[PDB]
Amino acid sequence: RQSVPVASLVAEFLQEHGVDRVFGLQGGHIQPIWDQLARRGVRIVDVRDEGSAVHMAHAHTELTGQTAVAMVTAGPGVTNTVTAVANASVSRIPLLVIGGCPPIPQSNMGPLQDIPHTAILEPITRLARTLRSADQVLREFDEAWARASGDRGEPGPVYLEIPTDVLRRDVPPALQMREHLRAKPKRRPQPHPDDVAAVADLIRAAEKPAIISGRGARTTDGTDLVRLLDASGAAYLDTQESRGLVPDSHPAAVGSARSAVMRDTDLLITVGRQLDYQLGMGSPAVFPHAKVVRIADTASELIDNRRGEVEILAEPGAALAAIADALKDHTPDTSWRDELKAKHRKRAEDYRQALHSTENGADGHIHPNRIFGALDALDGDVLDLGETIMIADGGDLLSFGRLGITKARRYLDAGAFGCLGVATPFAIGAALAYPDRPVVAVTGDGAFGITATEIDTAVRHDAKIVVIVSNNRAWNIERYDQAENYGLVVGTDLADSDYAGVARAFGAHGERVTDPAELEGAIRRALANAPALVDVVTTQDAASPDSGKGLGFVPDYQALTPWNDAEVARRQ
Amino acid sequence: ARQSVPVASLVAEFLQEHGVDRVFGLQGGHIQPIWDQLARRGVRIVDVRDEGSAVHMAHAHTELTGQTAVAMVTAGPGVTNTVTAVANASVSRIPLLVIGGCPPIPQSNMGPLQDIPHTAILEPITRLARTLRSADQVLREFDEAWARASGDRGEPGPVYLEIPTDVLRRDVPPALQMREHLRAKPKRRPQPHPDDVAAVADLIRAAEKPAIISGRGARTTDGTDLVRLLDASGAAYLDTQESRGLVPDSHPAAVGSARSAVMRDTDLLITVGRQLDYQLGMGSPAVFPHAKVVRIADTASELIDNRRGEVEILAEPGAALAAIADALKDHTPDTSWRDELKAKHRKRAEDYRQALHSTENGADGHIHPNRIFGALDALDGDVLDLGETIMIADGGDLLSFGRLGITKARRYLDAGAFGCLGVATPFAIGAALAYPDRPVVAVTGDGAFGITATEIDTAVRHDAKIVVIVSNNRAWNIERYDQAENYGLVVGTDLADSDYAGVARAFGAHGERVTDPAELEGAIRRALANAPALVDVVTTQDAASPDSGKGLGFVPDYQALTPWNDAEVARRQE
Amino acid sequence: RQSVPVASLVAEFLQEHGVDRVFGLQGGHIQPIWDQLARRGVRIVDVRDEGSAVHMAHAHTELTGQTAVAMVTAGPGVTNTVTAVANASVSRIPLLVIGGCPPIPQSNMGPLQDIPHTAILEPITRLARTLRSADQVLREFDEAWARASGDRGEPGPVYLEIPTDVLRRDVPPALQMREHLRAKPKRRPQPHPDDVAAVADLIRAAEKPAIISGRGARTTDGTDLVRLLDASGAAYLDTQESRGLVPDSHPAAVGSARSAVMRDTDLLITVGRQLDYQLGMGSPAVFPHAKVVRIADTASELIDNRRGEVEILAEPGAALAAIADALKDHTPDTSWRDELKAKHRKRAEDYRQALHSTENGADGHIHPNRIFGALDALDGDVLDLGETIMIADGGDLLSFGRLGITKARRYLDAGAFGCLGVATPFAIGAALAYPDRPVVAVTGDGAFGITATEIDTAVRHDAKIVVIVSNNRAWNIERYDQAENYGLVVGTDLADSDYAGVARAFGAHGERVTDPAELEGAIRRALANAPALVDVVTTQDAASPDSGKGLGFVPDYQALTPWNDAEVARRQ
Ligand SMILES: CC(C)(O)C(=O)SCCNC(=O)CCNC(=O)[C@H](O)C(C)(C)COP(=O)(O)OP(=O)(O)OC[C@H]1O[C@@H](n2cnc3c(N)ncnc32)[C@H](O)[C@@H]1OP(=O)(O)O
Ligand SMILES: CC(C)(O)C(=O)SCCNC(=O)CCNC(=O)[C@H](O)C(C)(C)COP(=O)(O)OP(=O)(O)OC[C@H]1O[C@@H](n2cnc3c(N)ncnc32)[C@H](O)[C@@H]1OP(=O)(O)O
Ligand SMILES: CC(C)(O)C(=O)SCCNC(=O)CCNC(=O)[C@H](O)C(C)(C)COP(=O)(O)OP(=O)(O)OC[C@H]1O[C@@H](n2cnc3c(N)ncnc32)[C@H](O)[C@@H]1OP(=O)(O)O
Ligand SMILES: Cc1ncc(Cc2csc(CCOP(=O)(O)OP(=O)(O)O)c2C)c(N)n1
Ligand SMILES: Cc1ncc(Cc2csc(CCOP(=O)(O)OP(=O)(O)O)c2C)c(N)n1
Ligand SMILES: Cc1ncc(Cc2csc(CCOP(=O)(O)OP(=O)(O)O)c2C)c(N)n1
Ligand SMILES: [Mg+2]
Ligand SMILES: [Mg+2]
Ligand SMILES: [Mg+2]
Ligand SMILES: [Mg+2]
């Protein structure tokens, strides 16, 4: 080892920890790190807005399991990340944000961009620190890295900033410890056999077991989950954060029976999933017959809103496998699951076939479902949807996408946070992670306006993305709440913008579609010429399931009117 | 004769009664009940493409008009999209109100849609950040927050209020709806003490080289009491980016091209509503080696930072300036230093401005950005009146060129002490809607513009007559230059030759590209006749601004700029 | 100037700013400052509990107007101050707390006492900062000093901590600026004449004007207040934080007519006073006929709960004088004030005479009012109450003290915060500030147990205090709420402790009293042998006004039941 500046050690720490790319936007306060990353051969993915760099890192970690890294300058560079940090905090995604900050001698003196970055980010990070001791920077990086994984907290984003005088300070070789530089494996806490047995007993006693998966299950490959589904006879639901773990044809997979499963299950088993608003707070009002069991590698998916009759805090794969083993010699009663599955095959197949011929709305414009129809039609022709990373974003468009996107290798969207504008930055992170196939992002026009200029980033970095915009000239799920519940539509209209022209202005391939019969060709040409955008002139006359269920109205107790009605009855 | 009405109605009424005739924002369900009531009262709703831009619009509105402005945004990402623009308003000490959505009280901490700790995130960069849980007290909490935005119990700047949707829908009995909370209130007017006035006038009589440097608080005045004091004192005058336009260009004190000379030699620095932050070298003795210090302001945020006054006046600055002018009634100032600076300033500024019309292309064959400022100067008195124009600047090298190139504006806005890239378009929109009779002109770097470009759509939908001129140098170019000069490696600072005119046309604005500098005057003339409009100017990468040359990109240990930093290193080793 | 360590410059800053004493408790982290203060001849008043040192500083500043200083070590030394800091924050008293903290190299590494002091104190200070730049320490001290006065905030406590490696670092003489070392005068913002005139017009139109004073009025000597009372014909009330500004015999002084003044005034004028719970939130329910005017040098006494038809933000003395001037040629209608005053003379004189002969309670023990009787009886004999600093603390005892303490030069008590245990630390600060006369502190036994060991501090530092304890073997106002509103008395009894013996064990003079006829002699002997304690065996059968009005019960809208009943009527 030689005496080297902090900036060099930070670059080395990152590379040794497996970082081969940093998302970011250059400023002088971080230039010393930026320089060293480039001299080490770390790819720098420079963006148009720092928020998008954090979104890119989120997508990288969520897909790959490798903690990703954004780097931004002092002041507005850091404050531009707060939305993307909050989003990663809510979704419990490990990532590191490296911020610039002013030199120590000028503290509190009004130097350029001295705002309290750590104070702003502390409520939505696992750690937010200013590193004032050159000798201890390496250690602070390694500990923050562990905390992003969930050590001393739960998985999520961490923030570190180094005053520029500290960045430029030398660290003697004695203080450069191999144990802080080196990559570390994930923790693997194991289940206790008594908890495994107690869950197996609940499954044997249950007539209508159901498993709902989430983030922690999606860290596994799905094979132990399928083993437990096979041993238990349970129905299976996933969530936006856990798509793709169970084959569609599996006798447990009943994705179009969500209400039926929640209403009747006598044993809900959560697997790395929160019982947040997305699952009716786990309320007895939404699960009126369910006993509860909770399995996760973090108590963030064990203690919220409902407690387990058993709770297992362990690596989910090992827990699922141990319970499957313990159900040796059990013959599950699958008659409820099978009855749901028969109804699911009809409902899901009818729905998917209908996507190819959905009528135009009263305004003469394309129903957004035709986008999902056209993608389904191209599957096995010009793209393999089962190898494709699908992204969804927007309001009505996002809700239609939850039903319209059924074959994807992986799925990302606006998350529990409802973070509009993720579609383009997610698509870019996904595409650079998996360069062999186009990534397809389907987005509302409202959402797309937030991060549209990242089309520039996609072209400059050659990220093979296809963005498809539902251009309905509106924040349409909002326009509909205003009409239905208030009788006045105001400040929710947008214009008939040329998003293909926006894409072409930033060097991407672009095409506008007004005729639904043109969608397959337009998407074919977009796939062949990625990065590409398809601007689809869509109807305002089309209520998504979210629209119809009051999501826009914000009831007192639950996100949706039907669940809220059930909760009001439970209360009395 | 009051009746029982929901909180959402009272909030809309509170705002209209406090003089709010417009609200910038982006609709979500959590704020819809307020949004609805604002529209039924006839308050204009200016709906944007990104909530950060709504807060920048409110900032511009307040900074120009002095009327506290309002942004309204939904829970979760709607609130977190504001943080940059809130920080910017906090650093610049601009009163504004952000009204955020938030989940109903029953669902607190349960993982409802968008339950993040908005108030904890915003508390470090607001004067007040609160969740309002008592229907009966919402009016009161609004009135108090409004007063704290003005600087009561703190200093001027942004405040944040959020009302859980169940509270928004709750009725308030009429007896709890107090006129005193609904009604508009006047600004405070603390007055100077005559002993402090006398003491300042004594310092001015004893000084040979008095200099006044203005800031935010001065810019809240019309400039006429400032001119009275300049006249009575014989002081030299500098402004800052936040105080342009208070003193006529031809005034014998106005020596804007003599910044280093004034700071090096003044024996009496008088700050008027101005911080001695990095923009004035921390007020360091290293940068003001001969100055005694006097500070005048209506807030100690412009009295106590880095240097203390031999006298500090905490008062409405207009009254303080007038009182000191009166106290100098029989003083005959020695103006010979000011006069010698002014004579040299006249020539240096005139030569500089003339040379803007003919600046040569850089080695890459592209337009020098100074030609944009030349073209605007040439059109003055032809198709636009720069003295009635609101000018905005944003970017890196472009912004530094703009500080020399923009000399005749009625009002000036830019990226601020925060160095907040992307303000150009949202500022221009707020400015144009405040002052609808003439185009607003925003000159921006391509880097900065990419942050808020989609707000061109907002300008077209709301008919904001803006002209945006882009220095398209295919780069974050002040950064590219720091990389080359101090590190020998240029990486992740290049952008592309994007069609910003095409982006503007895609959103229904007028757009044209300029590659030939002789085409600039026409392109800007056509842009002014067809606003909202963008002019995409292919500019050179071979052009170092004064900020570029002075190390701004490098971030020295003690001062923002190398020359000032060198002076501070010398001061330390005495 | 020479190159000197930060610790020396801090000692010099304090002495130059007028600090001639520092209250505190030594630890290694602050020893370098402690050492330099002692070498400069600054008196070190070392205490038994760091909280008491902050209370002492509070009393010094509140009495003298000079900002006072406590100094405490890292970790538990700082955390022991939080109550006394909160108390000073609520009362808006300028003070500086200097905390120790660990050296910079060991940050976040679990060094001895690395807890987040600044994060803990930030919600209840005007400034809380860690000073990491030796060169800028002087400047940070001067700015924090200004912020304690109210600059950029409102008057109250500030916290500064210097890592011990920074304390030991030299500062070059060039960076030691006279302007940061030197003492600074208080600000004096002046009224605008239009606001003065508008207030004078409201006074001319009012039939029943009333002035209520507070903290900001008590920063003046009272003479401009009396000028305005004379020019306006207003009734006058003070509050616990504004006693002693208006002579008792003044025709406006109607201290026993509090409810009558609030009920009928048609013009309430606050003078440096909050309309907090102590004045019924300024509610129309408590002031049903009042227009409102607010005068103060801080908007902390202008904007809370009621807005002024006029609000003057100025030095209160100048504002009061300007309004008195503007009432040149006004003949005030004093008939309401005079009618209140005639009733006041009878009520107050009857009450004060009755203090000399209050009966023992049913349990055979002294009524606490006899303490106030005995003090009244000694006035003009062995002490001059009009030159005496009186302190009150406790529950029932505190409430009886508000009526029983009527002649004092100055009065301190538990404050709006209701901070039990202030009595002894306040008495010590007061006594060292004004060494020529004994200070008398009257306290409940509950309150006294919190800070009793500071009797040791009083003896070691020769603070001439007399503490008189109402020893009723109870948190008695709490015992009474439990009996009246819950029917069960539990965990509110104390024991028949020997507080005279406690005092004698720490080297003070002590005496126990069981016979009310012994009180005058015991208090005479205590005054002659200060520091001294008188342990008065008092009754549990004695409801104070606070007890009778529900203070213990915490109603929904107001601190007291009658005010709360009025608010409930106003709401409907
Ligand atoms: C408040 C506001 C407007 O300002 C916002 O900020 S909103 C933020 C933007 N939007 C969001 O982030 C979305 C938030 N909401 C949601 O995530 C969802 O409403 C929910 C998770 C809370 C509830 O979703 P569901 O459990 O209903 O899941 P979906 O996948 O949406 O399924 C809807 C229905 O289609 C069914 N379905 C699913 N896949 C299908 C398929 N393939 N074929 C046919 N039907 C299918 C499904 O069973 C179900 O019908 P049913 O069983 O209730 O009768
Ligand atoms: C760190 C990083 C890069 O990552 C960032 O985030 S930077 C953020 C974006 N940039 C900014 O926000 C800029 C921040 N810096 C500044 O604001 C300024 O550098 C400063 C306030 C610190 C210094 O500005 P000056 O006091 O030098 O003022 P300017 O108006 O720029 O004047 C520069 C020179 O032009 C002169 N000048 C002004 N008007 C003139 C005129 N009309 N004609 C000729 N010369 C003129 C002026 O006198 C002076 O020359 P001199 O006296 O020093 O020799
Ligand atoms: C909640 C709990 C129990 O856990 C706690 O923590 S309590 C904390 C400990 N206690 C406190 O900090 C006290 C808090 N409360 C108070 O400060 C008071 O209740 C109050 C400020 C809110 C209200 O006080 P008042 O305005 O009633 O003032 P007092 O000086 O107490 O006067 C009481 C009465 O005696 C009268 N009075 C005053 N001086 C007199 C005199 N000299 N002679 C005769 N009567 C006199 C006075 O007029 C009034 O009677 P009326 O007009 O209402 O009929
Ligand atoms: C940053 C932010 N601001 C506001 C909102 C609130 C919202 C949730 S859904 C929606 C409408 C989205 O319109 P889009 O055109 O994308 O989709 P569509 O319904 O098909 O027309 C809004 C405004 C959220 N969640 N995030
Ligand atoms: C949100 C944010 N992120 C980064 C930065 C740091 C910066 C300051 S100046 C600059 C270059 C701006 O490039 P532009 O193209 O607008 O101008 P020009 O130099 O003429 O090419 C950067 C990146 C700031 N202040 N704010
Ligand atoms: C630190 C703290 N803990 C509890 C309380 C709550 C309280 C307010 S009054 C009171 C009883 C005081 O008993 P004392 O014996 O002093 O007075 P007396 O009624 O005459 O017997 C308590 C416990 C407060 N305010 N502060
Ligand atoms: Mg839309
Ligand atoms: Mg943003
Ligand atoms: Mg550029
Ligand atoms: Mg007691």
Short mmCIF file of N, CA and C in Angstrom, two decimals, chain C residues 126-174:
data_model
loop_
_atom_site.label_atom_id
_atom_site.label_comp_id
_atom_site.label_asym_id
_atom_site.label_seq_id
_atom_site.Cartn_x
_atom_site.Cartn_y
_atom_site.Cartn_z
N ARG C 126 -31.82 27.85 20.18
CA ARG C 126 -31.81 28.80 19.05
C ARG C 126 -30.66 28.40 18.12
N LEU C 127 -29.74 27.57 18.59
CA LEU C 127 -28.56 27.11 17.84
C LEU C 127 -27.90 25.97 18.65
N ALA C 128 -27.50 24.91 17.97
CA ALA C 128 -26.79 23.78 18.58
C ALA C 128 -25.75 23.29 17.59
N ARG C 129 -24.46 23.56 17.85
CA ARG C 129 -23.42 23.26 16.85
C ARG C 129 -22.16 22.69 17.47
N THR C 130 -21.55 21.83 16.67
CA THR C 130 -20.21 21.24 16.88
C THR C 130 -19.21 22.09 16.07
N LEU C 131 -18.16 22.59 16.72
CA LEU C 131 -17.23 23.58 16.12
C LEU C 131 -15.94 22.87 15.73
N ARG C 132 -15.75 22.63 14.43
CA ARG C 132 -14.68 21.72 13.96
C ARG C 132 -13.49 22.50 13.35
N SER C 133 -13.54 23.81 13.35
CA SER C 133 -12.56 24.67 12.66
C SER C 133 -12.07 25.66 13.70
N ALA C 134 -10.86 25.41 14.18
CA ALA C 134 -10.18 26.17 15.24
C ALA C 134 -10.25 27.65 14.91
N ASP C 135 -9.96 28.01 13.65
CA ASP C 135 -9.90 29.42 13.18
C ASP C 135 -11.23 30.16 13.36
N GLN C 136 -12.35 29.44 13.30
CA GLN C 136 -13.72 30.05 13.23
C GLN C 136 -14.47 29.94 14.56
N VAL C 137 -13.81 29.39 15.59
CA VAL C 137 -14.48 29.19 16.90
C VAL C 137 -14.94 30.53 17.47
N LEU C 138 -14.04 31.50 17.49
CA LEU C 138 -14.37 32.85 17.99
C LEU C 138 -15.62 33.39 17.30
N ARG C 139 -15.63 33.36 15.97
CA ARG C 139 -16.77 33.87 15.20
C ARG C 139 -18.06 33.13 15.58
N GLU C 140 -18.01 31.81 15.69
CA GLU C 140 -19.18 30.94 15.98
C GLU C 140 -19.70 31.30 17.37
N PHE C 141 -18.80 31.57 18.31
CA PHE C 141 -19.21 32.01 19.68
C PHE C 141 -19.95 33.35 19.64
N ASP C 142 -19.39 34.33 18.94
CA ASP C 142 -20.05 35.65 18.81
C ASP C 142 -21.43 35.55 18.13
N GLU C 143 -21.55 34.78 17.06
CA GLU C 143 -22.84 34.63 16.34
C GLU C 143 -23.87 33.91 17.22
N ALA C 144 -23.44 32.89 17.94
CA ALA C 144 -24.33 32.10 18.83
C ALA C 144 -24.81 33.00 19.95
N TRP C 145 -23.92 33.82 20.48
CA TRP C 145 -24.25 34.85 21.49
C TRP C 145 -25.36 35.78 21.00
N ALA C 146 -25.26 36.24 19.74
CA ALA C 146 -26.30 37.10 19.15
C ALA C 146 -27.62 36.35 19.00
N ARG C 147 -27.56 35.10 18.56
CA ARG C 147 -28.76 34.23 18.43
C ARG C 147 -29.42 33.95 19.79
N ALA C 148 -28.66 33.84 20.88
CA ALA C 148 -29.26 33.70 22.24
C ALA C 148 -30.09 34.94 22.54
N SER C 149 -29.64 36.13 22.12
CA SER C 149 -30.45 37.36 22.28
C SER C 149 -31.72 37.36 21.44
N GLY C 150 -31.78 36.61 20.34
CA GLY C 150 -33.02 36.51 19.53
C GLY C 150 -32.80 36.74 18.05
N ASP C 151 -31.56 37.10 17.66
CA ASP C 151 -31.17 37.31 16.27
C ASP C 151 -31.50 36.03 15.52
N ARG C 152 -32.16 36.18 14.37
CA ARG C 152 -32.46 35.03 13.47
C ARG C 152 -33.40 34.06 14.18
N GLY C 153 -34.02 34.43 15.29
CA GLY C 153 -34.91 33.51 16.02
C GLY C 153 -35.75 34.23 17.03
N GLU C 154 -35.53 33.92 18.29
CA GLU C 154 -36.18 34.61 19.43
C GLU C 154 -35.28 34.32 20.61
N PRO C 155 -35.37 35.07 21.71
CA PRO C 155 -34.44 34.88 22.82
C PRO C 155 -34.53 33.46 23.35
N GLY C 156 -33.38 32.91 23.71
CA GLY C 156 -33.37 31.60 24.37
C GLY C 156 -31.97 30.99 24.39
N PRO C 157 -31.89 29.72 24.80
CA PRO C 157 -30.62 29.06 24.97
C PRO C 157 -29.97 28.64 23.65
N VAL C 158 -28.62 28.71 23.63
CA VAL C 158 -27.78 28.17 22.54
C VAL C 158 -26.77 27.19 23.13
N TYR C 159 -26.41 26.22 22.31
CA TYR C 159 -25.48 25.14 22.68
C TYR C 159 -24.30 25.11 21.72
N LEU C 160 -23.08 25.15 22.24
CA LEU C 160 -21.84 24.99 21.44
C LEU C 160 -20.92 23.93 22.06
N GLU C 161 -20.37 23.06 21.22
CA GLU C 161 -19.46 21.99 21.69
C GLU C 161 -18.25 22.02 20.78
N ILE C 162 -17.04 21.82 21.33
CA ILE C 162 -15.74 21.82 20.61
C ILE C 162 -15.03 20.50 20.91
N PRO C 163 -14.88 19.61 19.91
CA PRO C 163 -14.11 18.36 20.07
C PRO C 163 -12.75 18.66 20.72
N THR C 164 -12.28 17.81 21.62
CA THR C 164 -11.13 18.15 22.51
C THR C 164 -9.86 18.40 21.67
N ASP C 165 -9.68 17.75 20.53
CA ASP C 165 -8.51 18.00 19.62
C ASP C 165 -8.60 19.43 19.07
N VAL C 166 -9.80 19.91 18.81
CA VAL C 166 -9.95 21.30 18.33
C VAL C 166 -9.66 22.28 19.46
N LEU C 167 -10.12 22.01 20.68
CA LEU C 167 -9.85 22.85 21.87
C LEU C 167 -8.34 23.09 22.04
N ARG C 168 -7.54 22.11 21.68
CA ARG C 168 -6.09 22.12 21.94
C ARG C 168 -5.35 22.67 20.73
N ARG C 169 -6.04 23.04 19.66
CA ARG C 169 -5.39 23.56 18.44
C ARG C 169 -5.10 25.06 18.58
N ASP C 170 -3.96 25.52 18.07
CA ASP C 170 -3.59 26.95 18.13
C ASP C 170 -4.37 27.73 17.06
N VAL C 171 -4.70 28.98 17.32
CA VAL C 171 -5.28 29.92 16.32
C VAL C 171 -4.28 31.05 16.07
N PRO C 172 -3.86 31.30 14.80
CA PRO C 172 -2.91 32.37 14.51
C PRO C 172 -3.54 33.72 14.81
N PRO C 173 -2.70 34.70 15.20
CA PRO C 173 -3.19 35.97 15.74
C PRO C 173 -4.02 36.76 14.72
N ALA C 174 -3.75 36.57 13.43
CA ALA C 174 -4.44 37.29 12.33
C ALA C 174 -5.92 36.94 12.36
#
